[PDB]
Amino acid sequence: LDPKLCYLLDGILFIYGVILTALFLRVK
Amino acid sequence: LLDPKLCYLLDGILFIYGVILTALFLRVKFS
Amino acid sequence: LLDPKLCYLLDGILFIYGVILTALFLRVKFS
Amino acid sequence: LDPKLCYLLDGILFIYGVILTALFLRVK
Amino acid sequence: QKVTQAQSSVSMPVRKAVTLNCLYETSWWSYYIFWYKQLPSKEMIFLIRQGSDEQNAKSGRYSVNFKKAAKSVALTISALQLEDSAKYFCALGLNTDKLIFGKGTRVTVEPRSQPHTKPSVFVMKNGTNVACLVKEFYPKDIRINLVSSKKITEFDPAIVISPSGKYNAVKLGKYEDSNSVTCSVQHDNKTVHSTDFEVTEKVNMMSLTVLGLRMLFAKTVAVNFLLTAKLFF
Amino acid sequence: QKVTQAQSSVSMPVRKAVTLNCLYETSWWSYYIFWYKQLPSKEMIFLIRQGSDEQNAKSGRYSVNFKKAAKSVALTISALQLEDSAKYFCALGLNTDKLIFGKGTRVTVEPRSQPHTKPSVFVMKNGTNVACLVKEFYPKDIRINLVSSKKITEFDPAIVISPSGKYNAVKLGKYEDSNSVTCSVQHDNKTVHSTDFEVTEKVNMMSLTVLGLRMLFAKTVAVNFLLTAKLFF
Amino acid sequence: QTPYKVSISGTTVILTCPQYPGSEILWQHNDKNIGGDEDDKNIGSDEDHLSLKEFSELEQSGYYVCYPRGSKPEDANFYLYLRARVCENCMEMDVMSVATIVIVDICITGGLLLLVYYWSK
Amino acid sequence: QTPYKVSISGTTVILTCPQYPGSEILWQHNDKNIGGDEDDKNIGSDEDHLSLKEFSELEQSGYYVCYPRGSKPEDANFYLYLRARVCENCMEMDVMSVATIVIVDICITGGLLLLVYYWSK
Amino acid sequence: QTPYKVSISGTTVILTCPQYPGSEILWQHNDKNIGGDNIGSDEDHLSLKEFSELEQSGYYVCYPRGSKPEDANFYLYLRARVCENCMEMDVMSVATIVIVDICITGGLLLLVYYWSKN
Amino acid sequence: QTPYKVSISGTTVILTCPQYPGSEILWQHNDKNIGGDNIGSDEDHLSLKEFSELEQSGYYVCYPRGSKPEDANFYLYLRARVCENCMEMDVMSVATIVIVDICITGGLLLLVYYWSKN
Amino acid sequence: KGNHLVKVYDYQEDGSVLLTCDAEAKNITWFKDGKMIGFLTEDKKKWNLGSNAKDPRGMYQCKGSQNKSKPLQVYYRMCQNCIELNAATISGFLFAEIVSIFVLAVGVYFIAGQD
Amino acid sequence: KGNHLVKVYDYQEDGSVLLTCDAEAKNITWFKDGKMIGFLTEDKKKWNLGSNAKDPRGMYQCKGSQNKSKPLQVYYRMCQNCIELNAATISGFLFAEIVSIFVLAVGVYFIAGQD
Amino acid sequence: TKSVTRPTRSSAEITCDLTVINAFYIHWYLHQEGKAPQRLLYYDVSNSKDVLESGLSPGKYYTHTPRRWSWILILRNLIENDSGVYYCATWDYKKLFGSGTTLVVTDKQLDADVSPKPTIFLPSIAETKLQKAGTYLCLLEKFFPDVIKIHWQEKKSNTILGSQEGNTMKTNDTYMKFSWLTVPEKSLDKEHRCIVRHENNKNGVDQEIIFPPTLLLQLTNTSAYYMYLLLLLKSVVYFAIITCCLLRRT
Amino acid sequence: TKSVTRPTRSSAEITCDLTVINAFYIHWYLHQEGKAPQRLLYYDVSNSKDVLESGLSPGKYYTHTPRRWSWILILRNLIENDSGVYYCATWDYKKLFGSGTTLVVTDKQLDADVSPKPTIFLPSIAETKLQKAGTYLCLLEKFFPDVIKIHWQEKKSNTILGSQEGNTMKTNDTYMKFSWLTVPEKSLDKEHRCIVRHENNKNGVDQEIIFPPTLLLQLTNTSAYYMYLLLLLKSVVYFAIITCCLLRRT
Amino acid sequence: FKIPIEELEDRVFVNCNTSITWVEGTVGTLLSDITRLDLGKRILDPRGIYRCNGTDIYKDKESTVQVHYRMCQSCVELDPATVAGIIVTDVIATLLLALGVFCFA
Amino acid sequence: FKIPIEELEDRVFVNCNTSITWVEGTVGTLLSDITRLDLGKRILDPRGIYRCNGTDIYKDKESTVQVHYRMCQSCVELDPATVAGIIVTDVIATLLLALGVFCFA
To answer: Is there an interface between P and H (3+ Cβ pairs < 8 A)?
Structure first.
């Protein structure tokens, strides 16, 4: 349970980073 | 073994980057 | 006890009202 | 079974009365 | 040295008396005469002993009549019973001596006088063996014939004295069908077959309160409908 | 009709030969001489039979020397073994006839020549009974004395031939203390007492490799994002 | 013969003895006096009444003979047999006594509305 | 007193005996000689070294006394007790020795990009 | 002093006597001894399964071993009537669903009022 | 000659000795006789269920009846560590999902490239 | 008895319980939880608690002319306010709380649409 | 023994196995599957196979001064490359292979839309 | 009493049960059919010698003492005219006798098993109402020595029941007997036995034949009392909504 | 072979085990200490009569045939000079003998129980290392007729073990024997027996003396090692796509 | 001389020694044996006057007994807190319903 | 005179006959009984110099023992094929990431 949480913490962190890069870059 | 503490060293790096782009995106959206 | 016969005294009143409005609604729809 | 039927007879009677009032009143 | 008993069998009824004879013959000057009885299970029981020098010996229900001038001695069994059915021996007779026995007489004791009763027969089977059972009856004139078209064997009846003083009899017989066989009896001029034997004060308030809440809800629906209709006109 | 055997005992070692003598005496014209042996469990076994009209009878390891002019007959047991330790009888002798036996001679067979070995004694108790046990030793000159200040009984030793061809001996003895008793042996000029016998490195690499693949994937996402952004400007 | 009207209201049970309305009455219960004994002041007689309070189904349920003055107790030719599940604040009410309140509630709710409608001139 | 620095690299275990740096040393192991025996050529001494290869946790794990020439073996007042899970191509590395490679990887990946950016004039 | 705590979960009654923490205690019911092995006599718990009213309703006495039951603290009197998978609405679940029903009705009709005025 | 074939399905080990097709054979394990009725001694199969490592790991000898086990062909040495409903990725399932992953990624992104250029 | 005097009389036609202090004295003084919540005169012996349908709990005791008695914790779960939470009440609770909210919301839509 | 000489020594602190040819001779000559895959000098007696974590299979034998011994098929499933295919790995394999393909396809849509 | 069934030209052991301490002479009598009991011999016990009769040579009768105060008469070279009942006797006066032992001397004409074989019966169905009783019947057959004793016992007791036997009728070469018992009313459905003592039984032990004989309405009124009190706190919320929306027009 | 221990002025039964079909004469021999085996008598079996020796009157020896082809010699009025070993014999030539039966005639000088009473021993502790073996010892005592047979058997087998007895030494009025056995190394901790055959052994059955002797982390690191190697062969496919789409602009 | 009113599980009998002649009330049933009467169920409330005659000890005396029962299971426990909290809000609901009818006309 | 280092399931003890005086190293704990010392866990790597005094046989001799342990469970098995195949592609990924940064500016 505790080793498995870090492998779906990085998933929501990858998807949140990609979404907030793609939506930040729409400024031009 | 050293696995459980070692795995969160990347997910304290992606949190830094995620809060950096949320702090950069809130600036270029309201102002 | 008097519960089973007593409960249907309201559902013979709502049937009266329901058939009154169906008889009033069929009149004001066709004619 | 018999005491329970009168408590879902009044439900269809309430809903049928409300629907046939609301649809009758649309005449104006 | 001879002992003679010229009596084959005797038949005497219950509570009567019986004399048994014994002709001894000897050349001694002082001897004893012993009486023995033999049960059908082959047991010899000493009954009475008559010493030939003093008077007549009696012991309970036994008595001995002694004729010293002749050669006759005689046993009396008074007030007979049902277990006086034995064979009786006369014996003639210090630790080395022998007894000289006679050939023995047999006493068969018959029951008393009873009124006549009726048989009331029954029947019982084991697949091929049958057995007519006859219940109590006093005079011994019985005929226990069976009925079957298919006969193999038929042994004789066995009439025996009951503890009531009457008689019972069993007659076996092996047959094939062994199910439609019914025995009959010709006792005492009247035939006996075997076919006659063959044949709550708060539940009410809770329903009243629920009806009251129904009548309140059907008015709080009406007020809301009437005011929402007022909002549109 | 006499059979004489004036030989009390013989002692002969293994794989040697022995002659036993038997002086018979009779007046018949044709007779037979039988030889029997008796085990210590009291069993008679027929060995050999010498008919007094034809030549010397032999059967296996047995041979009979016959002197018809004299009265001497003689049994030979060649190539001796260990179960030739019995008592031997001479008998003299159609279904009704009897055998006339002699008083019997005893043959006790001794083992062969062996080099001398040493005793190696032990001891074993049952609360009050002791028993010195002596292991294999060839010459029979043994003295199995025990040591106790408190002696009650001491039976004799029992020397018996082992299946190895040497000897074993047990000497019982009952005492009170029965715990501080130690047996000794004086066999073959050298005393033997009994006191000398009395005394997680690949799980870590897998987590390191998975972290390395994470750090590669977070750069192969970055290269693809950076070039797809270049495609739009 | 005339009955003994047993009025049971709440817990109070009132028996009436009209067999001797021109004399002074007493009561009995299992050949033992009750009423006119001037103790346990819930019970108490009148010209014909007898009022029993804190009534129970277990005790005080049997033969209630009411006889006048100068009368041997076994002279009367009437007895009662009262067995009552006397209750606390509860009354007998069947189905027909509830529909007659429902219909009156409908005719007093729906008899006001066409009067408020007629008030509005 | 000065320790016996036990350097365990891979499989090779090197003990240093600096207690007599002005003499010629030997070793022992459970009161039995080792080193300077000129057989099983993996082991071998020096001025202070002792290099044991094909090491095992089971055997060669005990008392390693190092004494100079002309010395009775029970004269020294120091012993070792070495018990080692000597491994094949593996080294001790905790958590803190991996984050210091991750941070250096970030600062050598992200220290090139703002230099390639500055090259482009 | 400290009364017997009784707790009725579903159709199963379970009761505790918190007067002696650690000892060997026994239980009784109209002097019919309950304990020693159906029914369960734990270290301080009694687990009366299938609690039908007409056979288990009376005098329960909790006491350690070696002691007389009449020299104990006190008794209980239990007259429970239990049902299968049911609750008992005190004012903890009838003053909770009434609060959250209004704070879920007003927390939805206001959202519909926003969504409809736009 | 022909070795013992062992096959481990899930947590259940099953092994065969293909040296004698039809006979009455027995099985052993550290001279603890296995066969004759848990565990299963078939005509040439042994079905070791619940194969825990610390009690069943050693010397298995397959041989027909009437023969001495030490006069057989050879032995086995088994040190299996099994798990419940698991696989073991050799290069037959790691060179198959890698092939079909690229031939399902390039077989979808090309379809999106068609659907997007239209 | 052993200083256990209070009993409870039950099994009658009506729903009431009665604490019977089996102790010979005059003027028995009832209690509840250490305090003197009641009192009694003569001519009555069994104190009344009410209905078993109203669940009389507590810890009752009495006192005669001698020393005071030992308690008796009465517990009555004659519930009657029990509801049966099977799969036909919690599934008929998601039909009076979904139809009603949707009728109210299809009303409030029109109310705010009129404004 | 009965011409069964090879044994395997195990149960130690480290992960390695050792084939012990219990046969008195000098210069024991090891094999594997009929061929002479190894050899040995003196001063060492137990041939080494490697780690149990690397799964040593085969059919090993030896040979003394007398005739050659009988084999011993070693089988080691100390797997460590096992993955657990329960309902939380095959259902977390349809979330790294659906999100990734949809991110790649929402990229390729824009790539081809730019052309 | 028992039987002995030796063949011709054999030996027979006849033991007597008469146990007497400090006897001096033990006489031996023989009884045959229609004759008298005659003494064969008598055995001195202080000198251990037999004194025979004036009729036969020695080598026929021998008195054996296996234990102290126990005697067995051994007969030798049995002929068919040796068959009868054998007693042993002692003086004290009177002369006690020793219960008899029948000896049967046959020519080995058995050639099969000669054990008594029961074929038991059950009471009729009509007897068991109009008599308050029932009767068993235990027929035995095919047994040779004819010294047989049938007696009935209870299920668990030591009482002898009132049985009523019959005559040992003879078949062509074997025999046959039957016994039967009537039992009263209230001891009827129990177990009964037909113990049969005989010489040619299996294992020596005599046979033993066993004989048969509302809380539903209370919950659905308050599970619907709480629904209508939760549809009545939504109509008041809606009434507050429409009143607040109507009062802003006044 | 067994023993018989009757007193003086008694009777003794001596049976012989020699089973022979269709014999004609059965001889009887007597062997005493330091004398020769002499014939006492012989029994004709086709006529059933004893033919005695020239020394005693009849009334001493009797040959009894209980069954066909079984013979018992009954002695009568035992005197102390009657004690010895008794054989039975038949012709065929040779003359077979019948294993002996010792008869002891005492004056009832026993006055107690004379059964053999074991007092068994256990191997020493020092024997069980430096010899790889152990030895038992089974001492019997207080038994009168002295015809005793000790033999050792296994825990469950029918083998006779290599025991080594001793001489039947005599106490003041009783006797004493001991037997002992050595067993090898790998058959040591099992059960062994010291079966003792004797006449005055209780219930007739001979004695039988019994002798004592993490996998959770390992799977969740490689189930996520193969996911990141399958998200790294999609980023290379996408890198090839964008590189092929960027190189067409150069 | 009273008239014994004996009890089965639900049958409230009337017993005599001479012929029961009904006067006035719930007749119940008859019964086949004389000097008896069945009144039927306990929860039926049987009530009536039943004169009987004398017995073998107290003859020449006509006796009379009324039977009266109030074993109610048709009764309802009216509370002063859930009746006066249903009426006093139903008058409020009626006066609210008579507000909109004004409000239109 | 050495100092015996005895073993429980995980306790690497230090035993003497006279008072242990710690010199230098991992002190572990103390122990209540004299002439003892506890060093604690096997996987802790206890290491230190602990001089002790003589015994009842080898008295007037101060003895000394160092304890040293390398029972590693913090160690990692570095391979020359999955380290040199992660670094040599991470340099490739870094040089690819430093291509687009050129490609913009």
So the answer is: yes
